[PDB]
Symmetry: D3
Subunit: 243 residues, 6 copies
C-alpha cells in the first residue's frame, strides 16, 4: 500500500523490475488487451487512469505493452516513466488520419519524421530539433513490411494538439501540398522526448480516416481497420524481438 507509492512510477504504476527494455505504446487502453492476444505468458502489471500496462512474450522476448491516452502530454508522462523503469526501445502502434488521396483505411503509415505541431515536445526543446525515427527500428520495420501484401507508406506525419480548430480545412490543404502522409497527436512527442532520453523510437500508424456510405461498406471498413491494427502490432512485435 505505502511501499508501492514508494516503489512505483506515479502514473504508469510500475517499476524497473517489471518494465522490459522493449516497449510498445498505444493510445487506446483496450488495444493493449488486443495486442497481448498475440503474445504468450501475458500478465497485467497496472491499470491507472488511461495507462494500462501488460507484459507478454513474443518469440522468446519479453515486451511491455502500455496505453497512454490521447495527446502529447499523456504520451510524454508514459515515455518519461518508462525510461525511468529501464525502457531502451519504444514503438508507437497508433492511428492516423490520411493527408493524401490514395491512402486507404487500414493501410499503414510508418513515420520516418514528424512535424512538431504539438506543445509537449516544445516544453523540452526548441521546435528546430528534429523528430525522427531510429534507423535500427525502421530497418526491421521495412524488412518485415516489404515481405507482405498490405500497402504501407514511409514518410512524414504531422502531430498536433487539435483537429477541431476552425482552420482545420486550411491546415489539411497546406500539409497535403507539403507531402505529409497523415496526422496524429502523439508521434512527434515520442520522437523528440524519446530521443532526448536516449531511446530508440519508431511509430507505425493504422490509417483510420480517408483524406476524402452503407452499412456493408462500414463493416468492410471496420474490418480493414482491425486488420491494419493487427498488422501494425505484429510488425512492432517482430521488430522488438529481433533487437
Amino acid at each position: 500500500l505505502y511501499f508501492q507509492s514508494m516503489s512505483k512510477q506515479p502514473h504508469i504504476c510500475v517499476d524497473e523490475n517489471q518494465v522490459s527494455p522493449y516497449v510498445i505504446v498505444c493510445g487506446e487502453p483496450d488495444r493493449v488487451n488486443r495486442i497481448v492476444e498475440l503474445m504468450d505468458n501475458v500478465e497485467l502489471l497496472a491499470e491507472n487512469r488511461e495507462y494500462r500496462v501488460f507484459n507478454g512474450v513474443y518469440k522468446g522476448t519479453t515486451i511491455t505493452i502500455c496505453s497512454t491516452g490521447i495527446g502529447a502530454p499523456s504520451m510524454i508522462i508514459a515515455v518519461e516513466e518508462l525510461k525511468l523503469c529501464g525502457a531502451t526501445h519504444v514503438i508507437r502502434v497508433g492511428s492516423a488520419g490520411a493527408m493524401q488521396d490514395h491512402i486507404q483505411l487500414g493501410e499503414l503509415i510508418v513515420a520516418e519524421g514528424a512535424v512538431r505541431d504539438e506543445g509537449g515536445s516544445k516544453a523540452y526543446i526548441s521546435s528546430a530539433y528534429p523528430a525522427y525515427a531510429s534507423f535500427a527500428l525502421l530497418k526491421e520495420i521495412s524488412h518485415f513490411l516489404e515481405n507482405q501484401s498490405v500497402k504501407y507508406y514511409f514518410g512524414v506525419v504531422r502531430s498536433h494538439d487539435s483537429f477541431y480548430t476552425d482552420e482545420e480545412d486550411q491546415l489539411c490543404q497546406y500539409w497535403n501540398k507539403k507531402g505529409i502522409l497523415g496526422a496524429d497527436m502523439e508521434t512527434s512527442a515520442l520522437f523528440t522526448v524519446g530521443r532526448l532520453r536516449g531511446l530508440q523510437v519508431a511509430s507505425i500508424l493504422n490509417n483510420v480516416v480517408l483524406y476524402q456510405e452503407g452499412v456493408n461498406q462500414y463493416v468492410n471498413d471496420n474490418k480493414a481497420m482491425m486488420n491494419g491494427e493487427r498488422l501494425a502490432a505484429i510488425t512492432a512485435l517482430e521488430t522488438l524481438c529481433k533487437q
Copy 2:
C-alpha cells in the same frame, strides 16, 4: 451499431439527447464514479478510451459528468464534443500541484485565470487571448465556499504540457515569484476553447502536491485529498444546480 456512429460524437460517444447543458469534467475516469455517488437517478451513458460519461440529478437538476484524461488535447476533444451536444456551462473538477508554500494537501484552488503554457489553446488562438473563469460561476463557487471550513484560494494557475522537463525547478521558482497558486495541465485549455465556443467555464482544483514521511501521515494525506475532491465536486454540483 451503424446508426450510433452516425448519431454519437466520435470520442465521448454521446449525443444531444443525452448531454445536459450543465457539465462537470474531470481527468480521472474513476472520479466520475465517485462524483455520481453524490447524485440521484444515475446512469452510465458511454465508456470510450479515457472518456467515461454519466448523467445524474442533484437537487432537481440533471448534470452530465465526463472524464477527459490527462492533458489539453484530450480535454479539448471533450469540450468540443460536449458543446456540439448542447453543453452551456462546464466546470472542471480537477487536481493541481501547489506553487506556493502554505497551500496544504486537500485545500482548494479556484482558478480565476490561467497561464496558457499548453499548446492546445494556442492551436485555436494567439496566446494573448485571456484564459479566465466565468463571473456567474465564480460568484456561486465563492458563495458556497465562504460558508464552510476547508481553506481555499482564488487566483492564477499555470497549465502546461509537462512537469518532467529538465527546467522544471527553474519554472517552479519563476512562477512562485509571479504569485501563481498551483499548476495543472488542462484548465487554460478549457477556459480558452470553452469561452470561444460561448461556454460558461470554471475550474476547482484539489491540491495534491505540496510546493515543498511515515505511513500514518501518508494515510492522513490521502484522506485530506479525498476530502478536498469531495468538496470540489459538491461545490460544482451546488453551483450548477443553481443556474
Copy 3:
C-alpha cells in the same frame, strides 16, 4: 523644490501620504475634473505631463483620481507609481470602440478579460499570462449596474497599440468573429501589470465608436457618450467606497 524630487514619484508627482488605496485611472486629463464633480472635499495633488492627480471623497471614502494619457506605456508608469504610493484597488474608467453590431454609443463594456495585443504587458511577462478583472470588483460593478437602465456588457476587450495600421479592417472582422466586445489601448496593461503588483483591478469602458449623420444626431450622440462616462465613473466610485 529639491525635497519634492526626493519625496514624489517622478511622473505622477505624488507620494504615499497623498495616494489613497482606492484609485480611479482614466486616459483623459479633463475627465479627472469631470469625475471630481461627483465628489466632496476635492483637492488637486499634481499636474505633470499627461498625469493629472486629484483626491476626493465619495460616501465617506477617500479616492484618488489620476489621468494616464493614451496607451499602455503611459498607463504602466501610473500603475507602477501608484502602487509605490500604496494603491491596492485600481479601476480604469475609459473609452472603447465597439467590436459588435448592437452596442450603442454611451453603453458600457465591463472588461472581464483582455486580449494582450499591446507591447507594454509583454515587457513584464509572457503573453500567455491572463489579463483579467478582479472578482471582488466585478461583483460590486455587476450589483450596481443590474439595478439601473443603461445597457452594459460583460466580456472580452482587445487592447492594442494602434488602430491606424493598414490591417485594421482585417483585425476588426477577425476579432468580431471571436466575440470580442470592444477595443481600447490600456486595459490589458492595467490587468497584467496591476495583478503582478498585487492590485485589485477592473475596467469600465464607455462606448464611443459604433462597430458600424446630421447635427442633431451628433448632439444626441455626444450626450449619450457623456451620460455613459458619468455612469462609468459613478459605478467605479460606488464600487470603491464599498471596499
Copy 4:
C-alpha cells in the same frame, strides 16, 4: 462645432490647412510652449488630451510643434494624423536615459538607428524592418552640431514600453555591452511608422539620466538639462528651415 469634427483630425485636432510640411514632435506638452519662445508669428492651433499644437516661424519657414505624450502608441497617433495633414519632415525633440558611462546630463544623443523594443511599430510591420534616421536630416543636424561646444553622440538608441520591469537592470547591462547610447520610449516608432508613411524622420534627444547629491548639483543638473533641451530644439529648427 459639428463641422470641426468633420474637418479636424480626431486627436491632434488640426487639419491640412494648419499643419506645415515641417514638424517638431516632443513628449511633453509644456515643452511646446518653451520651443515656440524661439520662434516668431506663434499661434496656438489645438489642445486636446496630451496633444498641444502650435505653429511658428523660424528664419522665414513655418514649422508646426506638436506634443505627443509618453510612449509609442500616443506618438503613432500623432505621426499618422500629421501625415494626413501634409507633414513631410518630422523631427523628435525628446529625452533619453544614457546607456553609457560618460554621457553627461544635458548632452545630446542623435539617434541614427533605434532598437524596436516597443510594440507600436510591431503592429505595422515585422521587427526585422529597420528603424533609422533620414540622411538629409542627419546631414544638417551634424553640420549644425559640429559647429558648437556641447558634446553630442551619434548612434543607436533603444525604444521600449517600460523601464519599470524587474529585469530592467539586466536589460541595461546587456544593452550597454551592445554599445547602445541611450533609451527612450518613442524614437523607433517614429522611425518605423514615419518611414512607412514616406516621411523624413530624425530624433534628437536630451540626456536626462546618467547611466550611473546636494541641492547645488541638483540646480546645476537642471540647468544643464534645460540647456540641452534648448540646444536640441534649436538644432531641429535650424535643420527644418533649411529644407
Copy 5:
C-alpha cells in the same frame, strides 16, 4: 552565349541534359577536384562563383559533383537548381565540428537528423518540420561503413548560421548536453528543402574540429582529416551507384 543564359540554371550554370539523378554536393570547390580523382570519364561542366560542377562515372553510374560554398543560402540555391535539372538523390559530403568529447579528427558523423538553427530552411517552412536523412541512403551508408575500420557515428547534428557569436560557448555546452554529435552550416537546409522537393537526401561529415600541439601532430591531424574526407566521398559514391 545568349542561348546559354536561356538554357542553363543561373548559378550552377548547367542544364537537365548534364545533371545526373545522383548528386554529391560539398562546400569546398577544390574538394570537387579531389572527389573526381576517384571516378572515371570525368568532365568539367561549369565553374561559376562558388559552384564548381563536374560529372564522372563510378562503377558504371554517372554522378554529378557540385560545390556549394559555405552556408544554407548558397546550399539552397544549388539544391533548387539541381532539382530543376533532374536530381533525385543528393548526398552532402562535408565537414563538421565535433560536439562530443571522444570524436576524433577524420572520424565520420552521419547525420540522421539535423537541428534547424539556420534561417534558410525557415524561409520555406515552419521550424517544426523535421530535417532528417532518407532511410534508403542511410541503409547503404551504414552497410558500407560497418564493413571498414574508421570510427563513425550516426545521430543528430546542429546546422547554424554563425560560430562566431559571443554566445558560442554557451551554445556548445547546451548542445553537447542534448547529445548532438557535431555542427555544420548546411545539413538541415539540404534535408528540409531537399525533402520538400521530393529528393532523397543524406549527409556524411568529416570531423575537422575537436570538441576540446607540435608540427608533427599537425601533419598527422591533416592526414587523418584527408583520410576522413576520402572515406566520406567513397561512401557517397558507393551508396549512389547502388540506387
Copy 6:
C-alpha cells in the same frame, strides 16, 4: 606551412599585417579581379574557398578587396575575420534585384537600411536591432554620386536567405508595397554584425534584375550591368580613400 595556420585567419587566410582598415567586400570572387583593375600596387593575399583577397592602392590609400560568396553566413565569417585583422571601414559592393518598377539594370541602390530577413544577423541579436548604414560613408557616397549621371536610389533593401520559396511572388508584392528598393542576401548581415563589432559599414548595389528579349537587348543589358558594377566600385574606392 604550420606557422601560417597559427598566424592567418582560418577562412580569409590573411593576418593583421595584411589587412587595411579600409575594406571592400563583394560576393563574386571574379569581381575582385575586376575591382583591382582600378587600383595600383595590386597584390594577391589569399585564395581560399569563396574568399579571394587582394590589396591595392587608390589615390594613395591602401584598400583590401575581399570576396565572400553568396549569403549571410559566408559574409559574416569574412566580416568577423576582417575585424580581427584590423578592419574599421567596410563597404559592400554587390548586386540586388529591384523591388520597384522604374529601377533599370545597372542603376545603383544605396542601402540606408536593410530588412533583416536572413538568419545570420539573428544569431547575434534580436531582429529589433536596426541594420543601417554609417552616416560618414553615406555622406561621401552621396557627394560622389550626385556629381555624375547614372541614376541611383537611397533607401531600404531587404536581405533574405532564399528567392526560391513558393511564396516568393507574395513576398515581392508585399515588400514592393512597403517601398523597399531592392533585395539581396548579405547587406543586413554586414550592417548588423559590422556595427556590433564597431565597424563603419555601407552597401552599394548594382541592379541586376528588373522588378518586371533579343540578343541585342541582352548585350545592351550586360553592358549596362558591367557599367553599374564599375560605378559601384569606383564610388566605394573614392569614399574609402577620403577617410
